[PDB]
Amino acid sequence: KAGCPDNGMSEEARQKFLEMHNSLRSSVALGQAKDGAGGNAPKAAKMKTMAYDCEVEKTAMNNAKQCVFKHSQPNQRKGLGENIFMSSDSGMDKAKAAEQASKAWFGELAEKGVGQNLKLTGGLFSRGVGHYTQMVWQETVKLGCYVEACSNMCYVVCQYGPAGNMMGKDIYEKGEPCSKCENCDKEKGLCSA
Numbered sequence: 085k086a087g088c089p090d091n092g093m094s095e096e097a098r099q100k101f102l103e104m105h106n107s108l109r110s111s112v113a114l115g116q117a118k119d120g121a122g123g124n125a126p127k128a129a130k131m132k133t134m135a136y137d138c139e140v141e142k143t144a145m146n147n148a149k150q151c152v153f154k155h156s157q158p159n160q161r162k163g164l165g166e167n168i169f170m171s172s173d174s175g176m177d178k179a180k181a182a183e184q185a186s187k188a189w190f191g192e193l194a195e196k197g198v199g200q201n202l203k204l205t206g207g208l209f210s211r212g213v214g215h216y217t218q219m220v221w222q223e224t225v226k227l228g229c230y231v232e233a234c235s236n237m238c239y240v241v242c243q244y245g246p247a248g249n250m251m252g253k254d255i256y257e258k259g260e261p262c263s264k265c266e267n268c269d270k271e272k273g274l275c276s277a
């Protein structure tokens with residue numbers, strides 16, 4: 085979602101990825117997101133707005149173009165986190181793929197649960213909610229994704245800068261929406277720079 089190269093990724097898909105990420109981060113920040121562990125995820129005091137980044141898309145593309153479903157190694161995406169997703173519908177619309185990937189990742193919260201302790205402990209890290217926690221990582225403010233049509237799958241990779249899912253760190257700071265940032269609408273809960 086914007087000024088990126090004509091590289092096979094659709095603008096519609098870029099826009100959908102960013103829109104979904106910010107919308108879902110907002111829902112969490114406002115205390116509106118159901119948590120499988122009980123109640124809703126806690127409100128966030130300074131959930132940051134994401135922007136789309138063409139350079140992050142470039143390293144996401146390096147993974148997706150391989151048409152093998154797997155996480156890239158850290159040095160193949162220096163300083164970035166990563167979520168991956170696949171569908172058997174190889175030729176599906178890329179915007180539709182963006183929506184499905186974003187929902188599947190976010191769904192870990194409702195389905196597996198996270199709870200009110202947002203410190204990324206070894207326990208939490210091992211419960212398989214790492215796609216969700218990366219989507220709502222407070223300090224992650226750059227998003228870049230690529231969707232590749234492969235022989236047997238539609239393969240989706242998003243990368244995230246700076247990387248989230250840092251062990252021992254909080255996913256986000258708890259508090260009333262906007263309570264710890266200036267450029268923020270109390271009814272949205274997202275902080276801009």
Ligand SMILES: [Co+2]
Pocket residue numbers: 155167168214215
């Ligand atoms: Co993963």
